[PDB]
Swiss-Prot record, chain A:
Protein name in the entry: WD repeat-containing protein 35
Gene that encodes it: WDR35
Segments annotated as WD repeats: 4-43, 47-86, 91-129, 133-171, 179-227, 232-268
Keyword Repeat applies: yes
Disease tied to this protein: Cranioectodermal dysplasia 2: A disorder characterized by craniofacial, skeletal and ectodermal abnormalities. Clinical features include short stature, dolichocephaly, craniosynostosis, narrow thorax with pectus excavatum, short limbs, brachydactyly, joint laxity, narrow palpebral fissures, telecanthus with hypertelorism, low-set simple ears, everted lower lip, and short neck. Teeth abnormalities include widely spaced, hypoplastic and fused teeth. Short-rib thoracic dysplasia 7 with or without polydactyly: A form of short-rib thoracic dysplasia, a group of autosomal recessive ciliopathies that are characterized by a constricted thoracic cage, short ribs, shortened tubular bones, and a 'trident' appearance of the acetabular roof. Polydactyly is variably present. Non-skeletal involvement can include cleft lip/palate as well as anomalies of major organs such as the brain, eye, heart, kidneys, liver, pancreas, intestines, and genitalia.
Keywords, ordered alphabetically: Cell projection, Ciliopathy, Cilium, Cilium biogenesis/degradation, Cytoplasm, Cytoskeleton, Disease variant, Ectodermal dysplasia, Repeat, WD repeat
Residues of the full protein shown: 1 to 922 of 1181
Subunit structure: Component of the IFT complex A (IFT-A) complex. IFT-A complex is divided into a core subcomplex composed of IFT122:IFT140:WDR19 which is associated with TULP3 and a peripheral subcomplex composed of IFT43:WDR35:TTC21B. Interacts directy with IFT122, ITF43 and TTC21B. Interacts with IFT43. Interacts with CFAP61.
Any one of the GO CC terms: centrosome
A GO biological process held by the record: cellular response to leukemia inhibitory factor
Keyword Repeat on entry: yes
Function: As a component of the IFT complex A (IFT-A), a complex required for retrograde ciliary transport and entry into cilia of G protein-coupled receptors (GPCRs), it is involved in ciliogenesis and ciliary protein trafficking. May promote CASP3 activation and TNF-stimulated apoptosis.
Localisation: Cytoplasm, Cytoskeleton, Microtubule organizing center, Centrosome; Cytoplasm, Cytoskeleton, Cilium axoneme; Cytoplasm, Cytoskeleton, Cilium basal body
Conditions for induction: By TNF.
Swiss-Prot record, chain B:
Parent-protein start and end of this portion: 1 to 745 of 1241
Outcome reported for the amino acid change (mutating residue 353 to L): In CED1; uncertain significance
Comment field on protein domains: Forms the trimeric core subcomplex IFT122:IFT140:WDR19 via the C-terminal region, whereas it interacts with IFT43:WDR35 via the N-terminal region containing the WD repeats.
GO CC, alphabetical: ciliary basal body; ciliary tip; cilium; cytosol; intraciliary transport particle A; membrane; non-motile cilium; nuclear membrane
Identification of the protein by name: Intraflagellar transport protein 122 homolog
UniProt source species: Homo sapiens (Human)
Length: 868, 707
C-alpha cells in the first residue's frame, strides 16, 4: 500500500474547483468549476479534454456519474440540474430541469442507475427515474438536508441533515429511526457530515460481512458501520473540516481527505479501521476525491488543479514454480477466488477460499493462510492448487514468511514455526515463541501459553532465510534467531519501522522497506569495533524487491514506474515497466503485470508475463549478435558464468559450429550437451542437423514441418512417436506410405486407448482398442462401463482358448450372470469352475446338467443340502 | 422432522402469551397475575414479576433488548424493562388482550376490547383510537408501517401508524369465525435491522400498498388458515383444518409455521400451509407457540401451566449414485445436483419428502402417501431433465428405499421386498435379522445387485432376479456402513465400533483395519483408494500404507476421481485429494506402475518429473516413457529410446544402463563406479575425457597403454 503523486493537470484562469467525480466504467473525469465551468477530462496526455459549458450559470457544486447509462449530471447554485449524454464523442445538454426555490445540496443515482434522489436545502426531496423526474416528491420538515444515499438494494435512503443527524428513510418518505451516532461521544461543538459513502457490494466484500457504510463528521471522527450498527469501527482523524470520503472500487481502502492545522492530507483506512498512510497533497485546500475504476489512481481537487496520485494496493499474489497465483473477490460468490494460473501450459486452476489473510510462495509450495469457521489454517498448496496439508494453528497468522524447510506465521506478539519439508516430505516440529521469550538454542512443544502475554512493541514484519530469522518490531528492533532450532542470537535496533524484509542468498544482507517508501540495506554480520550497520544507500518510492537466488550481490526493486538492478550497490540504467518481480535467477528477471491481469481476472493473457535480462546477459547476447561466435567466445571467457556459457553454446549450435559449442558445453558441466553434440556430429547431412537442432530447442512443430519438407515422412512419424502426439501420428499415417504402416497404425491406436484409459475416459478408449487389436485392456474398459453385452460379444469372439476367457468369466460371475459365465468357462478349459459357479449362483438344475455332461457328479448331497 | 423435549416445567395457571428475549436467553411467560422469567438454557426460573394486580393476557419484547410490555386484565399495560423493573403502567378502559411492539420504531401498540393505543417511546401520551369489536391479534408489518387487527367480529382491520383504517379483510363465515391468531411473514430485508445491537410513573391518555410483498397468515376459529396479502387479495385457497386454531407463528427466517390450537398438539406447516409432521402431542390446549429466535428451538405453553421447550431436529435425507446428489430442501423439495457441472435442478413434490433414492436414470422420492419414480430420459451425460415416470400410490412403511432400473426395493424390518414400478410385489426375501444397510452395486439393467448388511453381522449380496441371498462374510458386530471396491473385489465394512474393516470378498479374508470410521467410500475410479471419515478427521489410505489425515467437519458420502465428497449440514463439499502423497508412498516402495496409476489422477509437473527420474533409475522404462511423455522432455525420451533400441539388440547388462542414466543426469561419480563394475571402464574414460576432468581420468586407465 504505497502512494505518491504523479501528475498535475491544470484548469485555466485559476477557477476554484469544488467537485470531482471520476467515472468508473469510462475513465471520464468530470470536474466542476467555480464560475459555470464544467469540464470533462480523460487520460491517454489528455484524450477528451472537453468544455461542456452548455447551461450552468453561476457556480457548479455537485456532480455524479451514472455508471450504468453513462449519463452525467450536474447542478448549479441556481438550482439548474442538467443531464449530459455522450453523442458522437461529445457531451450535450438535455433533460434540463429547474425548480426555482433553493439549491441542490446533493444527488445520487440508484445502485442500478434507475432512480436519482435530489435533496434541496430547504428540505424538499424529489426522486426521479432516468426519464420522468417526479416519482415521489416530498417536502419533509423544517430541516436542511445535505446528503442522500441508497442502500445496496435501493430500499433505504438515508438522508443527512445540516445539524448532523442522519435519518433513515424508506424508498419513500417514511421516516424510520434516526441513526445512532457512535463516532462522536466527547464532541461539543456543531457537527456537519461532510462525507457519506455507502459501498454497495459491486466487486464483492473484503470480508463476508465487512463494514460498508461510512459516515465521517467534519470535526474529524468517522465510523464505518454495516447497515445500521450500534457498535462499529470508530475512527479518529485529525482533519480540520474533513471534506471528503471515498471508498475504493473494491470497498477495501477508505480515502479520507481533509487538512490538519499543522497542510493538505489524504489519510487512508481499511474497512476495519486500520490506518495505512498519509499523502501530503500540496496546495491550499483539497475539495474532493475520486478513485479510478481500477483502483490504481486517486484524483483529487486542489484549488485550480487536479492532482493525481498513484496507488499500489496490497494484491494477494505469489509465484510458486511456474505459476502466478493471484486472488480476487467477485460479487456472486462470498469467498475469495484464487487462480493458480499455470503459465507453462497456460492452464487455470480456480479455487475458492474463505478467509485468505495472505498468500506466500517459496519454491513449489504456497501457504494460503486463512481464517476458519484450532481457529486459523495454513493451507500448504501445490503449484496446481491441490491442498497438501491444512495445519490448524491458534495465533492469528498475520505475517507469513516461507523458507524451503520452514514456514513461520506470526501474530503481533508471537510467531509459530512449522517444518513442512526436508531438503523430503512432512516432518513437522511445531513451536510457539513470544517475542520477548529469548529462547535458547533448542528445547517445549506447541505451548500456546506464550501468545497471550501482550507487549508494548508489536511485530511489524518478519522474514526468514534458510539459516536465520529476522523479526521486525514497530520500534525497529529487529531480532535475529537461528532458524532450524530457534534461538535468540542478536538484536540490532534499526531506525525506522519495517514493512518488508528480505535476505540475500548468503543471508548476510537485509533490505528494509519501511511503512513509507524508504529502502535501505543493512549488514548483519560485520563487526564495527557494534554488530550491524546501515549501508549508506537509500531510495525513495520503493514498492517491491527481490534478491537473486544465485548471486548474493544482485538485487532488484521497483521504484515508481521503473526497475533498478543493483550489483553490490551500483545501479544500472532503469528499465521502464510496471510489474511485480516474480523471479530473479540466472541473470534474468521474470515479472508480471498484475494490474492488467486483475482487470480481466477470468482470462489472463500470456502477454502479461515479462522477462527482462540484466546487463551482463544483454551484453553477451548483443555481442554474439554483432561479432561472430569466435570473438564473443573470448569475451564471455573474460567473465565466466554458466548462463553466459550456455548462451554461447546455443548461439553456436544455432550456427552449427559444433566446435565452439562443445567447448561451451564443457564449460557448463553439461554432459547432455556434449552427448548431443557428438550425436549431431554423427549426422553427415545438413538440413538434417538443422532438424535436430530445431528439435533441440523444443520447436517440435518446426522440426516436423522441416522433416516433411525434405520428404522424410519416416522421421516425422518417428519424432511424433517419441513424444506422445499419437493423434499427430494417426494424421501423418493417413497420407503417404511407409515401410511398416499397419504396425504403426495398430500401435498408435492401442497407445491412444491407453492414453484415455489412464484418465478414466472409457467409451473413448473403447473407440480405439478396437481399430487396434487389444484384448487385455478392452475387457476392463467394457466392465468399468457396464456394457455387459459387449463383454459377451468379446468373450464369444476370442479364440477357443485364451488367457482372457477366465478373466471375463470371473467378471460375469461377480456381476451375477450365470449362463454367460458357464459358456465362458466352457469355452476355456475348466468345467469344474463352470459348475462351482452354478452352485454358487444357485441355478442348481443347470449345475446338475453340467456335472452329468462331464461325468464328475460328486455333487449329490449339495442339491439335497440345498433342498434343506 | 423430529422433536426432543428439553424441559417440561409446569406452572400453576393457564398460559396466555409467551415472549422471548431477542438474545434468546430468557422467556417471560404469562401465568396468572404474575410473569415468569425463565432461563431457556436449563428450565430454571428467576421470579414471578409482581407489578400487575390481575391476570396477564399478553407480553412482548422490543426487538432491541430492553423494554418489554405486559398487558393485563387490570386494564393497564406496564412497560417493563431489562433488569426486571417496570416503568410506565399506562392504562385503558378494558382488559388489554395483545400488546406487541413495532419492529422498527418500538412504537408499542396495545389493543383491548374497545380501542387500541399507540405509544412511541418519545411520546408523552398514549393515542387512543376506537375499534369496532374485540381485538384479538396484533401483528406489525416487518417494516413497521402497518398494524393489522384481527377481531372477534371476524374482520381484519389494517391501519397505519396514525390509526387510519387503510383496508379491511373479510373472512367468510362472519362472527361465527373469529380470527384468533394472525402473523406477518417475517422474511424481509429488515429482518436483520436489530442484529447489531449493543417509580412506575403513569402516562397520560389521549383521544401504493399494492406492490408491497407481504403475507398475513390468518388462523380463524372457523377451522381454517389462509394467507392474505397486504392489499386484501387472498393467495391460494383457505386451508381446511380439524382443530380450532389458537396459535400461528413463524421460525426465525419465516420458512415454517407452527399452528396448533384446539387439539392438543402443535404441527409444523410450510409457508404454503402443507402439513409436515408434529412437534408433539400435548396434555391440554396450546394457547401459544413461538420459535426461539435464530434457533431450532420451539416452546409450547398450554392450559395446564406446562411449559415445554423442544428442539426440532431435521433429519438429513439424501442419496448419491456417482456424480449425482439428490437431497431434500425445505422439506418438500428435492434438489438433484451434478457434482461435476454443478447444474442444480429442483423438483417440487408439495408434501413431506421422507426418503430420496437415486440410481442411474432413476430418482425415487417417497412422499407420505405415494412414491414418485422419476426418470432421466435423454442420453446425455450431463442431462438434468427429470420427467415423471410412475406414481405407486399407497401408504408405505419402509426403513430404507433403494431404486434400481425397473424395480424398487423396500427394506422393512427383516423383509426385503422388491416392487415393480407398476406396483406388483414381484419378490420378497426374508432376511434372518435386522437390515441395517442396503446398497445397489450395479449390474445388468433389470437383474441387478443389492448389498445387504445385517445386524446379525452377516453380509449378503442379493440379486434382484434370483430369490437366494448370496453370503459374503460373517464378521461379528452390526454393519453400520458398507461399501464395495471399484472392481467389486474388495469390501469395506464399518461395524458399530468405529473400525473400518476391509475384506477380500473372494477369499473371505481380512486385509487391514483402521480405528476411526463412520463412513467409508472406495474410489469409483482407482481400485486401491479408500476414504473413511471418523471423529472429525478425513483419512485416505492407499492399499496397505499409512493414512493421510486432514481435519474435516462432516462425513464422507462419495469419492470420485480426486474429490472427497463430504456432507456437513446439508452442504455438499468437495475436498481435493492430494495424489502426490500416495504417489511418493508408492515410489519409496519401488512400485512404479501403481505410482503412475495414481499420478494420472492429476499431479504437478515436478512430481511427474520426479516419478520419471525414479522410473529410470529403477529400470522400469515403460513407466519412464509415459511419465516423460507427460512432461515432454525430448532429451530423456531419446535416451530411453536409445536404451530400448540397444536392448532390442544383444544388450542385457543392467549396470551399463544404470551407469548411462546416472551419467546422463549428471552424477559423474556414481556413474563412474557403475561403469567400472561392469566390464567397461573405457566408457568411464570417455565420460571423463568428454568433461575434460582429466585429473579423474588418470585413474580410469585400467587397460594400460595400448595407444
Amino acid at each position: 500500500m504505497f502512494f505518491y503523486l504523479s501528475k498535475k493537470i491544470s484548469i485555466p484562469n485559476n477557477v476554484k474547483l469544488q467537485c470531482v467525480s471520476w467515472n468508473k466504467e469510462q475513465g471520464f473525469i468530470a470536474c466542476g468549476g467555480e464560475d459555470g465551468l464544467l469540464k470533462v477530462l480523460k487520460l491517454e496526455s489528455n484524450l477528451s479534454m472537453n468544455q461542456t459549458l452548455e447551461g450552468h450559470s453561476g457556480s457548479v457544486q455537485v456532480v455524479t456519474w451514472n455508471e450504468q447509462y453513462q449519463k452525467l449530471t450536474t447542478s448549479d447554485e441556481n438550482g439548474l440540474i442538467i443531464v449530459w449524454m455522450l453523442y458522437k464523442g461529445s457531451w450535450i445538454e438535455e433533460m434540463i430541469n429547474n425548480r426555482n426555490k433553493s439549491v441542490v445540496r446533493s444527488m445520487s443515482w440508484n445502485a442500478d442507475g434507475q432512480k436519482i434522489c435530489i435533496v434541496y436545502e430547504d428540505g424538499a426531496v424529489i426522486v426521479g427515474s432516468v426519464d420522468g423526474n417526479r416519482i415521489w416528491g416530498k417536502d419533509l420538515k423544517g430541516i436542511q438536508l445535505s446528503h442522500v444515499t441508497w442502500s445496496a438494494d435501493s430500499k433505504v435512503l438515508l438522508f443527512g441533515m445540516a445539524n448532523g443527524e442522519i435519518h433513515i428513510y424508506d424508498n419513500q418518505g417514511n421516516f424510520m429511526i434516526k441513526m445512532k451516532l457512535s463516532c462522536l461521544v466527547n464532541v461539543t461543538g456543531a457537527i456537519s457530515i461532510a462525507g457519506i459513502h455507502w459501498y454497495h457490494g459491486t466487486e464483492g466484500y473484503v470480508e463476508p460481512d465487512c463494514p460498508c457504510l461510512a459516515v465521517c463528521f467534519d470535526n474529524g471522527r468517522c465510523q464505518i458501520m454495516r447497515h445500521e450498527n450500534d457498535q462499529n469501527p470508530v475512527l479518529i482523524d485529525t482533519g480540520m473540516y474533513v471534506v471528503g470520503i471515498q471508498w475504493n472500487h473494491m470497498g477495501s481502502v477508505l480515502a479520507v481527505a481533509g487538512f490538519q492545522k499543522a497542510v493538505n492530507i489524504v489519510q487512508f483506512y481499511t474497512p476495519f479501521g486500520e490506518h495505512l498512510g498519509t499523502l501530503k497533497v500540496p496546495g491550499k485546500e483539497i475539495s474532493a476525491l475520486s478513485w479510478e475504476g481500477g483502483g490504481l489512481k486517486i484524483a483529487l481537487a486542489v484549488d485550480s488543479f487536479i492532482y493525481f496520485a498513484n496507488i499500489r494496493p496490497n494484491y494477494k499474489w505469489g509465484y510458486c514454480s511456474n505459476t502466478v497465483v493471484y486472488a480476487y473477490t467477485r460479487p456472486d460468490r462470498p469467498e475469495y477466488c484464487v487462480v493458480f494460473w499455470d503459465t507453462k501450459n497456460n492452464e487455470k486452476y480456480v479455487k475458492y477460499v474463505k478467509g485468505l489473510i495472505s498468500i506466500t510462495t517459496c519454491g513449489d509450495f504456497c501457504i494460503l493462510a486463512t481464517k476458519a469457521d484450532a481457529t486459523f489454517v495454513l493451507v500448504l498448496c501445490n503449484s496446481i492448487g491441490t491442498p497438501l496439508d491444512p495445519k490448524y494453528i491458534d495465533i492469528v497468522p498475520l505475517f507469513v514468511a516461507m523458507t524451503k524447510t520452514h514456514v513461520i506465521a506470526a501474530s503481533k506478539e508471537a510467531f509459530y514455526t512449522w517444518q513442512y519439508r526436508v531438503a523430503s516430505r512432512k516432518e513437522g516440529r511445531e513451536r510457539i515463541y513470544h517475542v520477548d521469550d529469548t529462547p535458547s538454542g533448542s528445547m517445549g512443544v506447541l505451548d500456546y501459553s506464550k501468545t497471550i502475554q501482550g507487549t508494548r512493541d508489536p511485530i511489524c514484519a518478519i522474514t526468514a532465510s534458510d539459516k536465520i530469522l529476522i523479526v521486525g518490531r514497530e520500534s525497529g528492533t529487529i531480532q535475529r534467531y537461528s532458524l532450524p532450532n530457534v534461538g535468540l542470537i542478536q538484536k540490532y535496533s534499526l531506525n525506522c519501522r519495517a514493512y518488508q524484509l528480505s535476505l540475500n542468498c548468503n543471508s548476510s544482507r537485509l533490505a528494509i522497506i519501511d511503512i513509507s517508501g524508504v529502502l535501505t540495506f543493512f549488514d548483519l554480520d560485520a563487526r564495527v569495533t557494534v554488530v550491524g550497520e546501515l549501508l549508506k544507500l537509500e531510495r525513495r518510492d520503493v514498492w517491491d524487491m527481490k534478491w537473486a537466488k544465485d548471486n548474493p550481490d544482485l538485487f532488484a526493486m521497483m521504484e515508481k514506474t521503473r526497475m533498478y538492478v543493483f550489483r553490490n550497490l551500483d545501479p544500472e540504467e532503469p528499465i521502464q515497466t510496471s510489474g511485480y518481480i516474480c523471479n530473479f535467477e540466472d541473470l534474468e528477471i521474470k515479472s508480471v503485470l498484475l494490474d492488467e491481469i486483475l482487470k480481466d481476472p477470468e482470462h489472463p493473457n500470456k502477454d502479461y508475463l515479462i522477462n527482462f535480462e540484466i546487463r551482463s546477459l544483454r551484453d553477451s547476447r548483443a555481442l554474439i549478435e554483432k561479432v561472430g561466435i569466435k570473438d564473443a567466445s573470448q569475451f564471455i571467457e573474460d567473465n565466466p558464468h554458466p548462463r553466459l556459457w550456455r548462451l554461447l553454446a546455443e548461439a553456436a549450435l544455432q550456427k552449427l559450429d559444433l566446435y565452439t559449442a562443445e567447448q561451451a558445453f564443457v564449460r557448463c558441466k553439461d554432459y547432455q550437451g556434449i552427448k548431443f553434440v557428438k550425436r549431431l556430429g554423427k549426422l553427415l547431412s545438413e538440413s538434417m542437423k538443422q532438424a535436430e537442432v530445431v528439435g533441440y530447442f523444443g520447436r517440435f512443430e518446426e522440426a516436423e514441418r522441416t522433416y516433411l519438407e525434405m520428404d522424410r515422412r519416416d522421421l516425422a512419424i518417428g519424432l511424433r512417436l517419441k513424444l506422445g502426439d499419437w493423434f499427430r501420428v494417426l494424421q501423418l499415417l493417413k497420407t503417404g506410405s511407409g515401410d511398416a504402416d499397419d504396425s504403426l497404425l495398430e500401435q498408435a491406436n492401442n497407445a491412444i486407448g491407453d492414453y484415455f484409459a489412464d484418465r478414466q475416459k472409457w467409451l473413448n478408449a473403447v473407440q480405439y482398442y478396437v481399430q487396434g487389436r487389444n484384448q487385455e485392456r478392452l475387457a476392463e474398459c467394457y466392465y468399468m462401463l457396464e456394457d455387459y453385452e459387449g463383454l459377451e460379444n468379446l468373450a464369444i469372439s476370442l479364440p477357443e482358448n485364451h488367457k482372457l476367457l477366465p478373466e471375463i468369466a470371473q467378471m460375469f460371475v461377480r456381476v451375477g450372470m450365470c449362463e454367460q459365465a458357464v459358456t465362458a468357462f466352457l469355452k476355456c478349459s475348466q468345467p469344474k469352475a463352470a459348475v462351482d459357479t452354478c452352485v454358487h449362483l444357485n441355478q442348481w438344475n443347470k449345475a446338475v446338467e453340467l456335472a452329468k455332461n462331464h461325468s464328475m457328479k460328486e455333487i449329490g448331497s449339495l442339491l439335497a443340502r440345498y433342498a434343506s | 422432522m423430529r422433536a426432543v423435549l428439553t424441559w417440561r416445567d409446569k406452572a400453576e395457571h393457564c398460559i396466555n402469551d409467551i415472549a422471548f428475549k431477542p438474545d434468546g436467553t430468557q422467556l417471560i411467560l404469562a401465568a396468572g397475575s404474575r410473569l415468569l422469567v425463565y432461563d431457556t438454557s436449563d428450565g430454571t426460573l428467576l421470579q414471578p414479576l409482581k407489578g400487575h394486580k390481575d391476570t396477564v393476557y399478553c407480553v412482548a419484547y422490543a426487538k432491541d433488548g430492553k423494554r418489554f410490555a405486559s398487558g393485563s386484565a387490570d386494564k393497564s399495560v406496564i412497560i417493563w424493562t431489562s433488569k426486571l423493573e417496570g416503568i410506565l403502567k399506562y392504562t385503558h378502559n378494558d382488559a388489554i388482550q395483545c400488546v406487541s411492539y413495532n419492529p422498527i420504531t418500538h412504537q408499542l401498540a396495545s389493543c383491548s376490547s374497545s380501542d387500541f393505543g399507540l405509544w412511541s417511546p418519545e411520546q408523552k401520551s398514549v393515542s387512543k383510537h376506537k375499534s369496532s369489536s374485540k381485538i384479538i391479534c396484533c401483528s406489525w408489518t416487518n417494516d413497521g408501517q402497518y398494524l393489522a387487527l384481527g377481531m372477534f367480529n371476524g374482520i381484519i382491520s389494517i391501519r397505519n401508524k396514525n390509526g387510519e383504517e387503510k383496508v379491511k379483510i373479510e373472512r367468510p363465515g362472519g362472527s361465527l369465525s373469529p380470527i384468533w391468531s394472525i402473523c406477518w411473514n417475517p422474511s424481509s430485508r429488515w429482518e436483520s435491522f436489530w442484529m447489531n445491537r449493543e417509580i412506575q410513573e403513569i402516562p397520560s391518555t389521549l383521544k401504493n400498498l399494492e406492490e408491497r410483498n407481504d403475507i398475513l397468515a390468518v388462523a380463524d376459529w372457523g377451522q381454517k388458515v389462509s394467507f392474505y396479502q397486504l392489499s386484501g387479495k387472498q393467495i391460494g385457497k383457505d386451508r381446511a383444518l380439524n382443530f380450532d386454531p389458537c396459535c400461528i407463528s413463524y421460525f426465525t427466517k419465516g420458512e415454517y409455521i407452527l399452528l396448533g390450537g384446539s387439539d392438543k398438539q402443535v404441527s409444523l406447516f410450510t409457508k404454503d400451509g402443507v402439513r409436515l409432521g408434529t412437534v408433539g402431542e400435548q396434555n391440554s390446549w396450546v394457547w401459544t407457540c413461538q420459535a426461539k429466535p435464530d434457533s431450532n428451538y420451539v416452546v409450547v405453553g398450554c392450559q395446564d401451566g406446562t411449559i415445554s421447550f423442544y428442539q426440532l431436529i431435521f433429519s438429513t435425507v439424501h442419496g448419491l449414485y456417482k456424480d449425482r446428489y439428490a437431497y431434500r430442501d425445505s422439506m418438500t423439495d428435492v434438489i438433484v445436483q451434478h457434482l461435476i457441472t454443478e447444474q442444480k435442478v429442483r423438483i417440487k413434490c408439495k408434501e413431506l419428502v421422507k426418503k430420496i433414492a437415486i440410481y442411474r436414470n432413476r430418482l425415487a422420492i417417497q412422499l407420505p402417501e405415494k412414491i414418485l419414480i422419476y426418470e432421466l430420459y435423454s442420453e446425455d451425460l450431463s442431462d438434468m431433465h427429470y420427467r415423471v415416470k410412475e406414481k405407486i400410490i399407497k401408504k408405505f412403511e419402509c426403513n430404507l428405499l433403494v431404486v434400481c432400473a425397473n424395480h424398487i426395493i423396500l427394506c422393512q424390518e427383516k423383509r426385503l421386498q422388491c416392487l415393480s414400478f407398476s406396483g406388483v410385489k414381484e419378490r420378497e426375501w426374508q432376511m434372518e435379522s435386522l437390515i441395517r444397510y442396503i446398497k445397489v452395486i450395479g449390474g445388468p439393467p433389470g437383474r441387478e445387485g443389492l448389498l445387504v448388511g445385517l445386524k446379525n453381522g452377516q453380509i449378503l449380496k442379493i440379486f434382484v432376479d434370483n430369490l437366494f441371498a448370496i453370503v459374503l462374510l460373517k464378521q461379528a458386530t452390526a454393519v453400520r456402513c458398507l461399501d464395495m471396491s471399484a472392481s467389486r473385489k474388495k469390501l469395506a465394512v464399518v461395524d458399530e465400533n468405529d473400525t473400518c474393516l476391509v475384506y477380500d470378498i473372494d477369499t473371505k479374508e481380512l486385509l487391514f483395519q483402521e480405528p476411526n470410521a463412520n463412513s467409508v467410500a472406495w474410489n469409483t475410479q482407482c481400485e486401491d483408494m479408500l476414504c473413511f471419515s471418523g471423529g472429525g478427521y478425513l483419512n485416505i489410505k492407499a492399499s496397505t500404507f499409512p493414512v493421510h489425515r486432514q481435519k474435516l467437519q462432516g462425513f464422507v458420502v462419495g469419492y470420485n476421481g480426486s474429490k472427497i465428497f463430504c456432507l456437513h449440514v446439508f452442504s455438499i463439499s468437495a475436498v481435493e485429494v492430494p495424489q502426490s502423497a500416495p504417489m511418493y508412498q508408492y515410489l519409496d516402495r519401488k512400485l512404479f506402475k501403481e505410482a503412475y496409476q495414481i499420478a494420472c489422477l492429476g499431479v504437478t509437473d515436478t512430481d511427474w518429473r520426479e516419478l520419471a527420474m525414479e522410473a529410470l533409475e529403477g529400470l522400469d522404462f515403460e513407466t519412464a516413457k509415459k511419465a516423460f511423455i507427460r512432461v515432454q522432455d525430448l532429451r530423456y525420451l531419446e535416451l530411453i529410446s536409445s536404451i530400448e533400441e540397444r536392448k532390442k539388440r544383444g544388450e542385457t547388462n543392467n549396470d551399463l544402463f544404470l551407469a548411462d542414466v546416472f551419467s546422463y543426469q549428471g552424477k559423474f561419480h556414481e556413474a563412474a563406479k557403475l561403469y567400472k563394475r561392469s566390464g567397461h571402464e573405457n566408457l568411464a574414460l570417455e565420460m571423463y575425457t568428454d568433461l575434460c576432468m582429466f585429473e579423474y581420468a588418470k585413474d580410469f586407465l585400467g587397460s594400460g597403454d595400448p595407444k
